[PDB]
Design an enzyme around this catalytic site. Structure first.
Site, PDB file in Angstrom:
ATOM      1  N   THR B 185       0.950  -0.891   0.037  1.00 49.94           N
ATOM      2  CA  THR B 185       0.238   0.544   0.232  1.00 49.94           C
ATOM      3  C   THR B 185       0.720   1.389   0.209  1.00 49.94           C
ATOM      4  O   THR B 185       1.636   1.448   0.374  1.00 49.94           O
ATOM      5  CB  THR B 185      -1.056   0.133   1.075  1.00 49.94           C
ATOM      6  OG1 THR B 185      -1.533   1.352   1.520  1.00 49.94           O
ATOM      7  CG2 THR B 185      -0.245   0.219   2.589  1.00 49.94           C
ATOM      8  N   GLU B 327      -4.409  -1.906   5.157  1.00 51.16           N
ATOM      9  CA  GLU B 327      -3.533  -1.825   7.324  1.00 51.16           C
ATOM     10  C   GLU B 327      -4.531  -2.695   8.197  1.00 51.16           C
ATOM     11  O   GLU B 327      -4.225  -3.027   9.370  1.00 51.16           O
ATOM     12  CB  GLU B 327      -3.296  -0.415   7.583  1.00 51.16           C
ATOM     13  CG  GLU B 327      -1.720  -0.204   6.335  1.00 51.16           C
ATOM     14  CD  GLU B 327      -2.463   1.111   5.973  1.00 51.16           C
ATOM     15  OE1 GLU B 327      -2.958   0.822   5.003  1.00 51.16           O
ATOM     16  OE2 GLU B 327      -1.062   1.489   5.511  1.00 51.16           O
ATOM     17  N   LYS B 435      -6.688  23.684   2.516  1.00 45.59           N
ATOM     18  CA  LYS B 435      -6.660  24.796   3.756  1.00 45.59           C
ATOM     19  C   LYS B 435      -6.767  26.305   2.747  1.00 45.59           C
ATOM     20  O   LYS B 435      -5.483  26.718   2.373  1.00 45.59           O
ATOM     21  CB  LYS B 435      -5.476  24.632   4.336  1.00 45.59           C
ATOM     22  CG  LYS B 435      -4.988  25.621   5.270  1.00 45.59           C
ATOM     23  CD  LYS B 435      -5.491  25.416   6.369  1.00 45.59           C
ATOM     24  CE  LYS B 435      -5.840  26.156   7.631  1.00 45.59           C
ATOM     25  NZ  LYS B 435      -6.182  26.035   8.835  1.00 45.59           N
ATOM     26  N   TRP B 440      -9.784  24.479   7.516  1.00 45.94           N
ATOM     27  CA  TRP B 440     -10.353  23.410   6.292  1.00 45.94           C
ATOM     28  C   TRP B 440     -11.282  23.306   5.854  1.00 45.94           C
ATOM     29  O   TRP B 440     -12.499  23.210   6.178  1.00 45.94           O
ATOM     30  CB  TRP B 440     -10.100  21.945   7.112  1.00 45.94           C
ATOM     31  CG  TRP B 440      -8.589  22.038   8.146  1.00 45.94           C
ATOM     32  CD1 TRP B 440      -8.369  22.690   9.288  1.00 45.94           C
ATOM     33  CD2 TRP B 440      -6.622  22.017   7.711  1.00 45.94           C
ATOM     34  NE1 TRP B 440      -7.504  22.557  10.060  1.00 45.94           N
ATOM     35  CE2 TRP B 440      -6.413  22.222   8.998  1.00 45.94           C
ATOM     36  CE3 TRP B 440      -7.191  21.484   6.497  1.00 45.94           C
ATOM     37  CZ2 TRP B 440      -5.179  21.980   8.743  1.00 45.94           C
ATOM     38  CZ3 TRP B 440      -5.331  21.387   6.170  1.00 45.94           C
ATOM     39  CH2 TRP B 440      -4.034  21.484   7.281  1.00 45.94           C
TER      40      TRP B 440
HETATM   41  N1  LIG Z   1     -15.760   4.653   2.222  1.00 45.66           N
HETATM   42  C1  LIG Z   1     -14.570   5.632   2.473  1.00 45.66           C
HETATM   43  N2  LIG Z   1     -14.707   6.594   2.137  1.00 45.66           N
HETATM   44  C2  LIG Z   1     -13.850   6.912   2.302  1.00 45.66           C
HETATM   45  N3  LIG Z   1     -12.884   7.069   1.791  1.00 45.66           N
HETATM   46  C3  LIG Z   1     -12.040   5.957   1.951  1.00 45.66           C
HETATM   47  C4  LIG Z   1     -13.274   4.842   2.365  1.00 45.66           C
HETATM   48  N4  LIG Z   1     -12.984   3.729   1.917  1.00 45.66           N
HETATM   49  C5  LIG Z   1     -11.299   3.483   1.830  1.00 45.66           C
HETATM   50  N5  LIG Z   1     -11.283   4.960   2.170  1.00 45.66           N
HETATM   51  C6  LIG Z   1      -9.991   5.832   1.984  1.00 45.66           C
HETATM   52  O1  LIG Z   1      -8.669   4.984   0.999  1.00 45.66           O
HETATM   53  C7  LIG Z   1      -8.252   4.394   2.460  1.00 45.66           C
HETATM   54  C8  LIG Z   1      -7.518   3.386   2.181  1.00 45.66           C
HETATM   55  O2  LIG Z   1      -6.749   2.924   1.227  1.00 45.66           O
HETATM   56  P1  LIG Z   1      -5.853   3.927   0.115  1.00 45.66           P
HETATM   57  O3  LIG Z   1      -5.136   4.522   1.245  1.00 45.66           O
HETATM   58  O4  LIG Z   1      -6.571   4.477  -1.207  1.00 45.66           O
HETATM   59  O5  LIG Z   1      -4.395   2.448  -0.563  1.00 45.66           O
HETATM   60  P2  LIG Z   1      -5.234   1.054   0.050  1.00 45.66           P
HETATM   61  O6  LIG Z   1      -6.909   1.267  -0.472  1.00 45.66           O
HETATM   62  O7  LIG Z   1      -4.274   0.075  -1.380  1.00 45.66           O
HETATM   63  O8  LIG Z   1      -5.079   0.582   1.565  1.00 45.66           O
HETATM   64  C9  LIG Z   1      -8.234   4.918   3.406  1.00 45.66           C
HETATM   65  O9  LIG Z   1      -7.045   5.534   4.636  1.00 45.66           O
HETATM   66  C10 LIG Z   1      -9.088   5.883   3.031  1.00 45.66           C
HETATM   67  O10 LIG Z   1      -9.006   6.974   2.949  1.00 45.66           O
END
Ligand SMILES: Nc1ncnc2c1ncn2[C@@H]1O[C@H](COP(=O)(O)OP(=O)(O)O)[C@@H](O)[C@H]1O
Lengths: 526, 533
Positions: B185, B327, B435, B440
């Site tokens: 990731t 994670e 920002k 925010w």
């Molecule tokens: N339902 C959701 N709404 C908004 N953001 C989401 C949602 N589900 C997952 N995420 C976003 O995706 C992140 C997790 O995955 P990401 O950082 O894109 O990489 P990966 O999906 O490969 O773990 C979360 O921390 C969040 O930011």
């Protein structure tokens, strides 16, 4: 190479913490012995459980000391479940309908150091109190009662004991395989000693959608007792999901149950067929729709198909027939259909709902012949049901050297069929079956004919070996007082009462059967 | 004193064994690379998994060596899942949409010894092959193909390798805390090393009613790739329940997906928002009722509230909005009602299904401020979202001792609120939050307002630099089919639903938003493209 994830023990106290954290206001209704109805919630039950866990610890109990209960389904019993186990003690749920000499045996064998009981059982506890040597605290599950104190001098009171608990008590952390709770079976009763691990994985499994599956949108009424087989795990599973609960206390007759359903909008009800028969009788008389009820769980005894049809066609309520036993925490199977079942004609779909059900992940089933060998799972061959998995016992309490398991499997004592998808059908009790070649014979059905003979005081029936039919029934009879029946008229008595080929081959007169500590050790057979 | 219960490790191989025992004829549909459709079942996936697990054991691999995949959702991928983890190897799903140079980094950092891949990626593996010096077996997921043998000398073939495995292989029995699988990731991408115990516990939680709860009666179609957090756990939860599955293969555009739903009777489908835009867009054109579809799980990015409304109002389909991460393997929260909610007015009830949901048993959430101190869970205060639980990572792969946790909590990088009922609302990723002035701005809140406009098919909001306000929101909009909104009316659509000073200053139109390798909007390249105006 190990994974790199957080590791945390699977502890019962983490279930109540979760309900407190994310469902603390979700309503729990408790029918008390004094007619009162308590409106509490998971948050209050968690706080009381923590405080009672501290109060129990301050008594000086040792880790995994047994805490006995003789109690209905109510908020104080729910609190004790988490208080005892969470604090590292053993929550020992005792069936208060047993005979006093059975309770004396169980309580002393378990060595309960604390005995919580409801006011209903005050005369019962007072009566056996002097035989309960090891118990140090007798605790009525209520406030100070002077008549109660007359019957049991030295009695303590839940609503005073709990105030001795620290309000900021922290659940201890221990190995998840630590013993958590204790339930005895029906010679003597045998205790099955659960762990925190087995409890939590069982709630996980039971909380899946094709087993029971508690939702936070549910109003769950466990009518199945918390004093036996953990009320099928529902105090654990409803906490995992933050389900609402309606705890019915002592009033389990049909009118009271129908009123609980209609007053609190019960969506899921769990009981056994005899209790439901009272419920359905009242409901049909008063014309209620049981509007909020969506589904029922029926286990413990064979669920009658016409009961399933009544719930379905009168009420649009689905019936989950579930099967299990003390030795499986209790859940073994649950009758939920498979995809391919929607394509059968609706009536075949109904008969498929009739057996004891299919096992979830975490339990495995097989049937073996009389020498231990596997039999095909064709739905027709009958064999001795064997089970194993994450919440099946390894050995009974204080009885580890008795080589219980057979090749790592537990023999349920049931004869069953198993079809290719694991749908199980109880057929008989392994210990009751005489294996006369061709058709098998029930020993108790023969006894019940025999003991009804006016010239017999009592009698027993045993399978005895035969060179042609393998096993054949023998009648061990004791003549009624001042009577001298002949063998021929005793066997002639069976004519018309049962197929001729099931009639015992021979009669033997004894002047008395050779008793165990109550029943008859028919292992003689000598 | 310990309990007296049987104790058995929580192994991924007991999931597939259970499906083979009690759901062995339950049907699994697999769209293949060539253009063919295989009809198989759990009994067959399990027998092939057992046999592939034998064949991998015979390559000489050592315990917990990494088995890499570059593959679509199909029967062979499902088999590898169980063959690899079941035999004590680490199933390492790799995202084939990353740049070839990222793939070289990941495959060398993870030291994959075997690399399974679908025919779609034959060119790409052949190009980067000479930089994958620790891979000993390149295995095309298909039969021997001499053209393939041409691009990759020494190439082995799945349908040949599996026949080397014993048909009576018994799975090995090892510590449930053994590493099972690995996902990277995104500096460089980092590895999340799952265990058999974390996997099985997460499957238990996902199978509860208020999370997903796969049923034996479901036809489950994960459009979510099996290289994106193991298709959100579904290959495990479905095996635990014996659900039917439709594995969609390489074609995930809307028409392909509509056809799979209507042809195989899909009841539950799961994917990121962007794959649902194509599906819903095409479904409106052809007129299908998606008769069999009952439920949907939408996460990975914020589900537009108007997407939830469309499934509900037009199809009778309930959308479960869920949030999670690599994670967290991935399940963190799922949006299902509470009993209390059935009393509220009907549209306050629709409103409550929009946020990212509430945590199940096994997950804990809290928010902390910039100093790391707890913040009230009042539904309005914003903070850094922190997580811990049975399937949350402790440390990243090859980075065991690097102080990742804060007092035992994992910092998610998301900014959220948490209400007293435990419902979580994503305000933004820390990297995308805007920002402007001294406050925010949630780009996520802004885009979902914009997406709801009936003349836009989709939209994204990004902060772009401004000499006075530091940065300002820009609306990047995609016009819906048959519609032609003006910039002004898109901006006026914001009036009343958000503070005036938060309305984007400008609209630009694009034919499509740039998507990253998991189908999320690549806002970083949007910020670069529009750094002016
Ligand atoms: N339902 C959701 N709404 C908004 N953001 C989401 C949602 N589900 C997952 N995420 C976003 O995706 C992140 C997790 O995955 P990401 O950082 O894109 O990489 P990966 O999906 O490969 O773990 C979360 O921390 C969040 O930011």
């Amino acid at each position: 190479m190990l994974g790199q994830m957080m590791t945390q023990p699977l502890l019962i106290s983490s279930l109540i913490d979760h309900a407190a954290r994310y469902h603390g206001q979700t309503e729990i209704v408790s029918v008390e012995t004094d007619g009162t109805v308590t409106r509490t919630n998971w948050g209050e039950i968690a706080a009381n459980a923590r405080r009672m866990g501290s109060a129990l610890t301050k008594l000086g109990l040792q880790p995994q000391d047994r805490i006995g209960t003789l109690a209905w389904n109510n908020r104080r019993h729910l609190e004790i479940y988490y208080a005892a186990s969470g604090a590292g003690f053993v929550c020992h749920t005792i069936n208060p309908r047993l005979f006093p000499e059975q309770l004396v045996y169980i309580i002393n064998h378990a060595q309960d150091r604390v005995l919580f009981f409801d006011a209903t059982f005050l005369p019962l506890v007072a009566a056996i109190r002097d035989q309960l040597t090891e118990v140090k605290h007798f605790v009525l599950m209520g406030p100070r009662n002077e008549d109660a104190l007359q019957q049991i001098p030295g009695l303590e009171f839940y609503d005073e004991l709990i105030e001795t608990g620290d309000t900021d008590f922290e659940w201890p952390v221990f190995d998840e395989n630590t013993a958590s709770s204790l339930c005895y079976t029906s010679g003597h009763p045998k205790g099955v000693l659960y762990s925190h691990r087995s409890t939590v994985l069982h709630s996980f499994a039971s909380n899946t959608r094709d087993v029971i599956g508690y939702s936070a949108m549910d109003v769950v009424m466990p009518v199945v007792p918390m004093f036996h087989v953990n009320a099928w795990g529902s105090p654990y599973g409803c906490a995992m999901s933050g389900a609402q609960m309606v705890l019915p206390g002592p009033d389990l007759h049909g009118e009271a149950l129908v009123n609980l359903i209609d007053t609190y909008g019960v969506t899921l009800a769990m009981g056994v067929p005899t209790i439901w028969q009272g419920l359905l009788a009242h409901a049909a008389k008063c014309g209620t729709k049981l509007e909020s009820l969506e589904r029922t769980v029926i286990g413990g005894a064979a669920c009658p198909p016409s009961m399933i049809a009544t719930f379905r066609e009168k009420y649009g309520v689905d019936t989950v027939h579930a099967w299990g036993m003390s030795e499986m925490s209790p859940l073994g199977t649950a009758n939920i259909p498979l995809a391919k079942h929607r394509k059968l004609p609706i009536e075949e779909q109904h008969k498929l709902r009739e057996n004891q059900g299919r096992p979830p992940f975490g339990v495995e089933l097989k049937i073996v012949d009389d020498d231990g060998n596997d039999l095909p799972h064709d739905g027709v061959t009958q064999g001795d049901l064997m089970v194993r998995g994450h919440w099946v016992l390894d050995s009974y309490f204080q009885l580890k050297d008795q080589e219980l398991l057979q090749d790592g499997w537990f023999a349920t004592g049931d004869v069953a069929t198993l079809d290719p998808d694991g749908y199980m059908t109880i057929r008989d009790r392994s210990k009751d079956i005489i294996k006369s070649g061709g058709e098998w014979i029930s020993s108790v059905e023969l006894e019940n004919i025999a003991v009804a003979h006016p010239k017999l005081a009592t009698a027993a029936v045993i399978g005895v070996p035969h060179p042609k039919w393998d096993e054949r029934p023998l009648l061990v009879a004791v003549k009624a007082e001042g009577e001298d029946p002949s063998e021929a008229e005793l066997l002639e008595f069976f004519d018309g009462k049962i197929a001729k080929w099931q009639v015992p081959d021979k009669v033997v007169f004894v002047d008395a059967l050779p008793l165990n500590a109550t029943g008859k050790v028919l292992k003689r057979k000598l």
